[PDB]
Amino acid sequence: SGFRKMAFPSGKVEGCMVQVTCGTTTLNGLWLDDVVYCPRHVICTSEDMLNPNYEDLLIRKSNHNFLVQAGNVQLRVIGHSMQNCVLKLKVDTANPKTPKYKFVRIQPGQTFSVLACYNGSPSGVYQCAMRPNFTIKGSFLNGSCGSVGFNIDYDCVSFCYMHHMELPTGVHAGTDLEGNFYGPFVDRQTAQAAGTDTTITVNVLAWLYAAVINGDRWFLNRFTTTLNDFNLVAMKYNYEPLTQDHVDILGPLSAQTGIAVLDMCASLKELLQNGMNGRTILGSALLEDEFTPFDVVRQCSGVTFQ
């Protein structure tokens, strides 16, 4: 029936994208009701150096210095303010395409969709995960700052990510919509060293359950294991240790499939110690960890109206 890396429908977010220009600098903003949210470094001058005190850079920036447009049409800025690492530009008009929304701060290992945008206009949409070291591995060119990541629960955009910078490795760092960076990262072009790339165990298992639900059966074996035994293997291959909380989340998929969570762990243990035999799983030649148990259930599925 088919399991694909699946993004959320993005039309609701397309309707909120604007471009924001300050001085010379140009990035994207998110227009929700009468507020536009964007990265505060729209105010700088784009280098290493020269003044970093966003506070004092900001003392020099009046409402009329923030130029906010998308589609053709100008928005009038009546107030501004800095909230951690984001700016909130109050505009005189409420976005008529404002969707029901929430801001949340996502947890590591959660997935979300990113609408990549270049100075105000949609480019594309893709799915990714918040990595255990709080980077994300995205697709962001010079211009994409202020692009956002989000989920939709069946009736709602929850916004979870705003893009702010690329690191050395070429991985990506950003904030929630309250302006707080994920991880230790800061909006300043200094070294940071990313952090241990580590694999999201509960997501790999969920994806293995997806493979079975589609007939890519071969990695079923006749073994079982225990949480403590599996976690030894996990802390050799730099996987998240598995807990009973992970086991509980996977409960519906084990019962959806009749395959006990610890039996699936033994399949995974075997795949880790022995690799994939030149074989593949759901057209993947390595283990996949950016589908949550939530993402898998949703994709052999339920919702409807007929």
Provide the angle, in degrees to the nearest 10, between the axes of the packed helices 201-214 and 261-274. Answer: 100
CA 134 from chain centre, in angstroms, equals 10
C-beta of 111 vs 231, nearer to a second copy: 111
The smaller minimum CB distance to a second copy, of residues 2 and 258, is found at 2
> DSSP strand E in 92-225: where?
101-103, 111-118, 121-129, 148-153, 156-166, 172-175
Choose among Zn ion, a second copy, none what residue 26 binds, the Cβ cut-off being 5 to 8 Å by kind: a second copy
Residues designated catalytic: 41, 145
Cβ nearer to a second copy, comparing 119 with 225? 119
Segment lying near Zn ion (by CB under 5 A), choices 113-121, 144-152, 215-223, 293-301: 144-152
Element (H, E) at 108: none
Site residues (CB under 8 A) for a second copy? 1-12, 14-15, 19, 21, 26, 115-116, 118-126, 128, 137-143, 166, 170, 172, 214-215, 275, 278, 280, 283-286, 299-301, 303-306
What is the b/e burial string over 19-40, where b = at least 16 CB atoms within 10 angstroms of the residue's CB?
Answer: bbbbbeebbbbbbbebbbbbbb
Q: How far is CA 176 from the centre of its chain?
A: 10
Q: How far is the CB of 298 from a second copy (least distance, A)?
A: 8
Residue nearest to Zn ion (CB): 145
Nearer to a second copy, 157 or 262 (CB): 157
Asked if residues 27 and 43 have their Cβ atoms less than 8 Å apart, the reply is: no
Q: Which two tokens stand for residue 41?
A: 């470094």
Write out the residues near Zn ion by the rule CB under 5 A.
27, 39, 145, 164
